Each structure stands twice: as C-alpha cells, then as structure tokens.
Design a protein around this nucleic acid. Structure first.
Ligand code: UDP
Ligand code: CL
Ligand code: MN
Ligand code: MN
Ligand code: MN
Length: 553
RNA sequence: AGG
C-alpha cells in the first residue's frame, strides 16, 4: 500500500557544527582508555538511516485487533480532557526548544511576549479553519553517543527527527497535552510502563511472575517503529483521542492536527530545501510517546489473542513490551510466539529480533534493561533493575567544548544505584572527580523522560535510600550474568577492572570521611562495599523527608 | 523534536 517516505535527493543537513572530540579528555581519561571507540551519530549518516526506514507497508487487520480496539475506545470514553490555554501551553515549552522561523524563540514563548503569543493565536485560528493543508516539517538527524560494535557493523546511523514549527508545537499542547496526561493510564492501567520507577518496574514484573502457576515471559520491540506506523494507525489514534469527553474546539484542532501533521506531510532540511514526504509517525510531534505506546498496546494485545497467549500481564513503554503469561509447555510456547510475531507483522509492527520464550526473569530484556538478583545484608534475595553498561560508559566519556559528561554519570548513578557497575565504577569516578575539583556541594542537572532535575551530590545517599531502599548500599554476590557482562564491558572500553576500582574506592571513601558532614555520610553509605569491616547502616532521617514521585511518572 |  504506502511507502513510509519518499525523497527528493536533498541531503539531511546539520543544524550547527557537529562537535569534535578533543585530543585529551581530562574528565574521563581516568575512567577508560578506548576513546577511539566512543562516537556520536552524525547528520551524514542520516541518509543511510533514511534508506533503512523507507519501505512499503501493507497492513492486514482482523477480528482480534477490531475487538481490542473496541475495548480501548470504551476505556477512553471514561476520560474527560480539557484545552490548555494558549498561555499554559506556552509555559510548557522547554527552555531551549528550537526557535520559530517567524523571528522568536523559546524564551519569548515562555515569557509570553506579545509577538509570540500573537503568532500562535493565528497558527491556532488557522488550525480551526483549515483542516487539510499539510503543515511543513523539518527533518534532522539525532546526535547521540554509542560505543562502536564490530559485530553490528561498526557505527549506528543517526535516527531521523521530524518536527513542525515552534508555533505549531505550542498549539499541539493546547489541543492534546491534557490527553497525554490521562489517556494512556486510562486505557492500559497497570500496563502503562512510564508510571514506574526502576524498583516499581521490578516489583511489578515479580508480582506478575509469581502470580502464574507456570510462568513464561518474552519481550518484543518493533524494527523502526515510527516508519511502520500507517496513515490508518494515525487516524485510528485520533479516533481513540476523540472517544474522550472533549470540548468541540479541541475536537476540531485534534482532527486538523491529525490530517495536516500527524498522518503525513512534506519535510524540509535545515537549509530549507524540500527533502521528502512522510506517511508515517513524525518522531518530534507531541503525540509521539502516547501514540507509540497506545498503538503498540493495541497491536500487541490483539497479537496475544491471535497467538493464544494465556493470562497475559503486559508492560508497555513506547514500542517496547514485556508479556508474562501462563506457559503452555515449551513446544506450544514457541509456536505461540511465532504466531505472535506473524500477527504483529500483519499489523505492520515487524520485530527487530524474533522474540523467544523465557522461563527465568533475568534473561528478559526490555527498554535496554533487565531484572537481576543479588544478596542483601541479611542474606535475603534482592531484585533490582540493571543493564549493559557499555552505552552508559561511552556516554560517560563524551567530552567536548560544548558538552560535559558529569550529568550523564549522575543520571546513571541515580537510576542504577544498586548495580555493581554504578557502585564500583561510576560512583567511584564521580566522587573522585568532584572532590579533586572541590565541587562536591555544587548542584547538577539530571535528565530523565524529557525533564531536568537539580540535585546536590551530597544528597545522593538520601535520594538513593528513597528510590531504591537501604539495601542498595549492602548488596553482595551479584549474578554470573552481571559479573560477566560488567567485566566484559570494562575490558571493551579499556577501563580498569573491578579490583582496581575497589582500591580506588577505598581512597575515595577515606577522603570523603575525612571531610565530615554530608560528605562523610556519602563515604560511609556509598562505599561500605569497599571495606572489610562493614558498618551498620541505619535508615537516614533525611530520606523520610523526601518525595520523588514526579521523577518517574 | 516530543513525552
Ligand atoms: O530519541 C527518540 C527515540 C525513540 N523515539 C520513538 O520511539 C520509537 C521506538 O524507538 P526504538 O528505540 O525502539 O528504535 P526504532 O524502533 O525507532 O528503531 C521510535 O521509532 C520513535 O518514534 C523518539 O521519538 N525519539
Ligand atoms: Cl537481606
Ligand atoms: Mn523499536
Ligand atoms: Mn477527525
Ligand atoms: Mn524500542
């Protein structure tokens, strides 16, 4: 039926200059040695990505699909959502959001300058009046950092980001922001993945596992999800949005956004040239996450019914899903999974890697992470979320004129505080660097799910107890998989091995302790693993006084 | 670029 994209031959050009690595990396050259392996995806590579994501979709739905979709609309009809005022929408614009072509930027939008507010008024009037003329978009490469992988063909090409003008982005929020905050949870309940912290994700997966008499689990992820989303999927997304209780003016803007923007349109490069035409998800529109997650969930639940998955418990985040179900024996399990994949494939959600049944929770990877297990202070099993540290280590070494890696270190330390790789490697390095800089008590930004949080390094013990529990400071006897994977990632990036990190950690610990105050608490709590004569760690008062519920919702 |  439809091609995901068509191209004119015009290049996908960069915005600014693409920052160069330097001959010395003063903050990370004591973390690892193989700086040659750390690269950032470039705009040049964007044309290789374009080739990989351009293909003809044919989609074939069926009664399982139709029935799931009906149930979802019903669930959506229990939501009432409102328009945001123009002003509220303006003030949700992030501070460095790309500026408008019409001579204003995010600062103006957030301050509600008159020229900006006035332009946005007309953009919106035009949405209400013209339900048809396609809205132009800019296409850009995403620049992100990875470690080279010779197995997977050296360097990944940059993903494609497609977005409309700042004025339109503000209007999308007026129309849809309140739905983004309510609909997913309304139609998916506990299956909606972005509502859980790492420990809560873990707790949910364990409950689900223990509920089954004989559990089986698998993960799924779609190859190039955005390019696989069809015109019809997007219109079906609208009908899910329209099932909510909305004021008429929202309805009208939603429909017009759908027809003029979401279902497709022309793409221009940064130099202003026509680049191509799109007939799939623009990753960059406000509905990217909600849309991906709801469309993934519809296809996936229908595919579970098509395949005969029994008592499925799902967890979905964008195109990433886990299903924990009742095993029907391994022969049937395997065939049910092939049936799952075939249905998803008819639904236009083909797999990156064919999924596979598993019967041990450690072997299931979704959203680049997996549950693992270690022993606590009293010898009890303690489960936690971990991941391959390769990419976090590479990002820990991205250091240029424009970019400091310290914030990346902090983000990982917080999300993955119970992991052996955070505790032994990233914590040791982070604290050593900040001590020597004498910047321990300076606040840092921490990025997650598009939001920034300011954190003081000296509050890490409290934050960690709160997010992960006091046992995050006392885990030992990590698993074979985790020990093997961490040792291997360290060798691969030319980092010191764990025993070296241990002797560094002793020195970092002693030095923090000798400063007293909050620093010494960091020393005692964060590095208790580093000394033979363990200390008794008690709950921290400062931790009871904390609420972190917005960080992971 | 969005969440
Ligand atoms: O920086 C990102 C990463 C992902 N996505 C969205 O989430 C989807 C799933 O991404 P995944 O990481 O599974 O890779 P893909 O499936 O795109 O190859 C993408 O297609 C995008 O629509 C996005 O909008 N921006
Ligand atoms: Cl314990
Ligand atoms: Mn994918
Ligand atoms: Mn409509
Ligand atoms: Mn994915």
């Amino acid at each position: 039926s439809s091609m995901s994209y068509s191209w004119t031959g015009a290049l996908i050009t960069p915005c600014g200059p693409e920052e160069e690595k330097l001959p010395i990396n003063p903050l990370s050259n004591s973390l690892l040695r193989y700086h040659n392996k750390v690269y950032c995806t470039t705009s040049k590579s964007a044309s290789q990505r374009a080739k990989k994501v351009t293909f003809d979709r044919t989609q074939v739905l069926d009664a399982h699909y139709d029935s799931v979709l009906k149930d979802i609309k019903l669930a959506a009809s229990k939501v009432s959502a409102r328009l945001l005022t123009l002003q509220q929408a303006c003030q949700l614009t992030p501070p460095h959001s790309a500026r408008s072509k019409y001579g204003f930027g995010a600062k103006e939008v957030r301050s509600l300058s008159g020229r900006a507010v006035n332009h946005i008024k007309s953009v919106w009037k035009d949405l209400l009046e013209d339900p048809q003329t396609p809205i132009p978009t800019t296409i850009m490469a995403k620049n992100e950092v990875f470690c080279v992988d010779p197995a997977k063909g050296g360097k990944k090409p940059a993903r494609l980001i497609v977005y409309p003008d700042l004025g339109v982005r503000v209007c999308e929020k007026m129309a849809l922001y309140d739905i983004t905050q309510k609909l997913p949870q309304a139609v998916m309940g506990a299956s909606y993945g972005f509502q859980y912290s790492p420990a809560q994700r873990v707790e949910y997966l364990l409950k689900a596992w223990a509920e089954k008499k004989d559990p089986m689990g698998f993960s799924y992820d779609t190859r190039h999800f955005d390019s696989t989303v069809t015109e019809r999927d997007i219109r079906t997304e609208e009908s899910i949005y329209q099932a909510c209780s909305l004021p008429e003016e929202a309805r009208t803007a939603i429909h017009s956004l759908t027809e003029r923007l979401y279902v497709g349109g022309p793409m221009f490069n940064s130099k202003g040239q026509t680049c191509g035409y799109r007939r799939c998800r623009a990753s960059g529109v406000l509905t990217t996450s909600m849309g991906n997650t709801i469309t993934c969930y519809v296809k996936a639940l229908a595919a579970c019914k098509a395949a005969g998955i029994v008592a499925p418990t799902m967890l979905v985040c964008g195109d990433d899903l886990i299903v924990i179900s009742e095993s029907q024996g391994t022969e049937e399990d395997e065939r049910n999974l092939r049936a799952f994949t075939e249905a998803m494939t008819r639904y236009s959600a083909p797999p990156g890697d064919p999924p596979r049944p598993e019967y041990d929770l450690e072997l299931i990877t979704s959203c680049s992470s997996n549950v693992s297990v270690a022993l606590g202070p009293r010898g009890r099993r303690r489960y936690y979320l971990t991941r391959d540290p390769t990419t976090p280590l590479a990002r820990a070494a991205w250091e240029t004129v424009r970019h400091s890696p310290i914030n990346s270190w902090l983000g990982n330390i917080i999300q993955y505080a119970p992991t052996i790789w955070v505790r032994m490697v990233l914590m040791t390095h982070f604290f050593s660097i900040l001590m020597v800089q004498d910047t321990l008590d300076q606040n840092l930004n921490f990025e997650m799910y598009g939001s920034v949080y300011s954190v003081n390094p000296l509050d890490l013990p409290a934050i960690i107890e709160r997010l992960h529990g006091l046992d995050a400071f006392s885990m030992h006897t990590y698993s074979h998989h985790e020990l093997t994977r961490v040792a291997s990632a360290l060798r691969k990036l030319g980092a010191p091995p764990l025993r070296v990190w241990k002797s560094r950690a002793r020195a970092v610990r002693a030095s923090l302790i000798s400063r007293g105050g909050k620093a010494a608490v960091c020393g005692r709590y964060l590095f208790n693993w580093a000394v033979k004569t363990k200390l008794k760690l008690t709950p921290l008062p400062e931790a009871r006084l904390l609420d972190l519920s917005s960080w992971f919702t």
